[PDB]
Structure formats: C-alpha cells, structure tokens
C-alpha cells in the first residue's frame, strides 16, 4: 500500500503585494519535493536523494505548474475574501491538499481533493469522487458552481491518471 | 507531479 500527497498553501500579504505560495509533495508521508515563492529564484527542488535523478525538463515543467498555481491562489483568495464579506486589509490563508492512496497491486484505492480557508475546512471531494462536502454557505456557492461545471470529473482525470502513474514512477526510484 | 486547480471558487 502507498500514498502520494500535495499541500499547496498561499498566504495573502497586507495591502500591496503578492501572496506567499509554497507547495510540498510527500510520497508515503516523506517529503520529496518543495516549492517556495520567497526563494531568490523560486523553483521546484528535491528534498530527497532519489528525486535528483530526474531530468531538468521535469523540474522546469512542474515549476511552470507552480507558476500557474500562484495566479490561481491569488485570484481565489480575492474570491473567498468576497464571499465572507471581509475587509481587504486582512491577511488570509488558502490551502489545497490533494493526492491518492494506491493499493498493494497498483490500483487506485482512494482519492483526495480538499480545500481549507484560514485554517478551517472549506470544501472537500467525497469518497465517491463525484460529490462535494461544504462546511458553510460560501462553500455552498463554490459547491454549486463546481456541481454545475463538473470539477469532480476534472480532478478525477488526475486522481485516476497522472497521480497513480507518477506515484509508481516515484516508487521506482526507491 | 502536481496538478492545476483551474476552477474558480
């Protein structure tokens, strides 16, 4: 049995400025990769011996993914700020945790897609991987929008596809 | 590899 996890966190800075974004990956609850925007030259770097054997273009690619995720987090911070009717001076934190539990053979056993806002849980994809759970009434808005656009299908593309395969490849180097 | 959220909340 195995598992893969990504924790992507963004913290808005007061007034003028752009959020601090960090992203970390865990294979079997061991950190193997890390991104930070504060870094002098923000890129994805390996936090474990084996991941070093991956070609430069891998790092460039996933670094690009991080560079998009930044924008996503900035904008959706603004959105959640709006839903909760909060002053735009406040410092706020938005986190996305997502991953996959893979069984002994290699099949997908569980999928994970969840979002928290300012420490509290906002919205989480259920075990059936097609239904969401929403903590409050803003999360009810997000839930409605995502039921309508079918975000579960979009995430299932990853959970059932890239997640399992890349987890297997990351285990190939252990 | 990481994913991209894409969907606006």
């Amino acid at each position, epitope marked *: 049995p195995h598992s893969m996890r990504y924790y992507e966190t963004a913290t808005s800075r007061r007034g003028l400025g752009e959020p601090r974004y960090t992203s970390v990956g865990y294979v079997d609850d061991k950190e193997f990769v890390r991104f930070d925007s504060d870094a002098e030259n923000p890129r994805y770097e390996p936090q474990v011996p084996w991941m070093e054997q991956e070609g430069p273009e891998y790092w460039e690619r996933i670094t*690009q*993914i991080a560079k*998009g995720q930044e*924008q996503w987090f*900035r*904008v959706n911070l*603004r*959105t959640l700020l709006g839903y909760y009717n909060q002053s735009a001076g406040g410092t706020h934190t938005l986190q996305w945790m997502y991953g996959c539990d893979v069984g002994s053979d290699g099949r997908l056993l569980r999928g994970y897609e969840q979002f928290a806002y300012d420490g509290c849980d906002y919205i989480a994809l259920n075990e059936d991987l097609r239904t969401w759970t929403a903590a409050d009434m803003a999360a009810q808005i997000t839930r409605r*929008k995502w039921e309508q*656009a*079918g*975000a579960a*299908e*979009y995430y*299932r*593309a990853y959970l*059932e*596809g*890239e997640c399992v395969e890349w987890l297997h490849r990351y285990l190939k180097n252990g | 590899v990481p994913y*991209m959220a*894409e*969907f*606006g909340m």
Partner: T-cell receptor, first 114, second 110 residues
C-alpha cells in the same frame, strides 16, 4: 502547439437523418474536449464537455460526443437531427497547463434540409 | 449573460475603436476573440481577474484593458482593414467552459 482539425467545412443533411461531425486533435496525455454550437447571428454556446471517465458524453438534445484515446478524436453524433439544429459547430480542446485557453477547430456549417 | 457594445461599428483606416464587454457572472477569465471565415475563432487578448492582461495568439494591432472584474475592453487605436471582422467577448470560471457575447461587427474602410 495543440492543433484541432475538422475535415468538412460545410455539411448538408436531411431532416430526421443521422449526423456525424468530426473532430481530430493533436496528441495529449491530458485532453479536455468540448463541442460548442453557434446558431445564426449569436455567439457560441457550450454543447458538450469531457474531462474524464465514461468517454461517451451524452447531451440532452439528442447530441452525444465520443472521446477516442486511440483515434485521438472527439466525434459528435446525432441519431435524428431536427431542422433547428442548423448551426455552425466548433469543437475545441485544451490541455494541462493551458486548461483555460482553448484551441478551436475551423468549425462546420450544418445545413439541415427540410 | 455577457454583453458587448457596439454591436455594429464602421470606421476608416487610422480610426479609433473601443469594444466594451461586460459580464453579469463573476467569472475570472475574460477573452477577446475574432471570427473570420477560413480562420475560425482566434484569441486576441485575455485576462485572469481584474488588472491582469495576457497576450493571445494575434495581439498585433490590438490592446486591451481589464479595469474591473466585470469589464473588459479591446482597443484598436490605429484601425486597419485587416481588423475588419466579427469580435466576440467571452468569460469563464472553468477550464474551457466559455460564455460568449452576441458579437460585434466591425467594418474598416480604406
């Protein structure tokens, strides 16, 4: 980099007949596939979408598109077309990293003869 | 509902045209496309949230401004006959899921 191809620019079909509009696109490990319809003198409306799962996306208007990983396609079918279905049909695709930036086909003008 | 104005505009080469788009949804993405027979839909400029501006596939001759979440403007300061087309505004809050305006027909005369 991504490219989308619709082979026939103009298609004429009898009313009540069977229709197929074709969409082939450049390879993608992460294909997001769509069909948009544009009725005369309007903008585009999303008709069908596919991100994953059951490759047969089934519309409520009788339309349905099917994603083929092997053929690398997303073809649009209707068993029995209505006269109202006369429109211009665009298929569009996007990939990971540009999920929100579509690549459009040249479209196919559909004339339903009564 | 996405609205755009003007629905019809005629101008001369070297003219100054400003296409306005306003969305009632609170979508983060907004796009300016042009539709030409033979080329289909071609992205000019787009925007992810207010203040943001990104280059499309054919941005030459065009400029754009995203003042607010709801408004997106397309600016043609030196009009060209090549810019004679049918312009569409779109909005999205989901990958590849777009809501179009009803179109703006521009004619540029030599």
């Amino acid at each position: 980099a991504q490219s989308v191809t619709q082979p026939d620019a103009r298609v004429t079909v009898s009313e009540g007949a069977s229709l197929q509009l074709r969409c082939k696109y450049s390879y993608s490990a992460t294909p997001y596939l769509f069909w948009y319809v544009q009725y005369p003198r309007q903008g585009l409306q999303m008709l069908l979408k596919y991100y994953s799962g059951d490759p047969v996306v089934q519309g409520v208007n009788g339309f349905e598109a099917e994603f083929s990983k092997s053929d690398s396609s997303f073809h649009l079918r209707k068993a029995s077309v209505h006269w109202s279905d006369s429109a211009v049909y665009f298929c569009a695709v996007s990939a990971k990293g540009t999920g929100s930036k579509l690549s459009f086909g040249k479209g196919a003008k559909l004339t339903v003869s009564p | 509902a996405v609205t755009q104005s003007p629905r019809n505009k005629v101008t001369v080469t070297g003219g100054n045209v400003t296409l306005s788009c306003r969305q009632t949804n609170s979508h983060n993405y907004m796009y300016w496309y042009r539709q030409d027979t033979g080329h289909g839909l071609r992205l000019i400029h787009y925007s992810y949230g207010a203040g943001n501006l990104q280059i499309g596939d054919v941005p030459d001759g065009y400029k754009a401004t995203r003042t607010t979440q709801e408004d997106f403007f397309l600016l043609l300061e030196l009009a060209s006959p090549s810019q004679t087309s049918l312009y569409f505004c779109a909005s999205s809050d989901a990958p590849g899921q777009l809501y179009f305006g009803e179109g703006s027909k521009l004619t540029v005369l030599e």
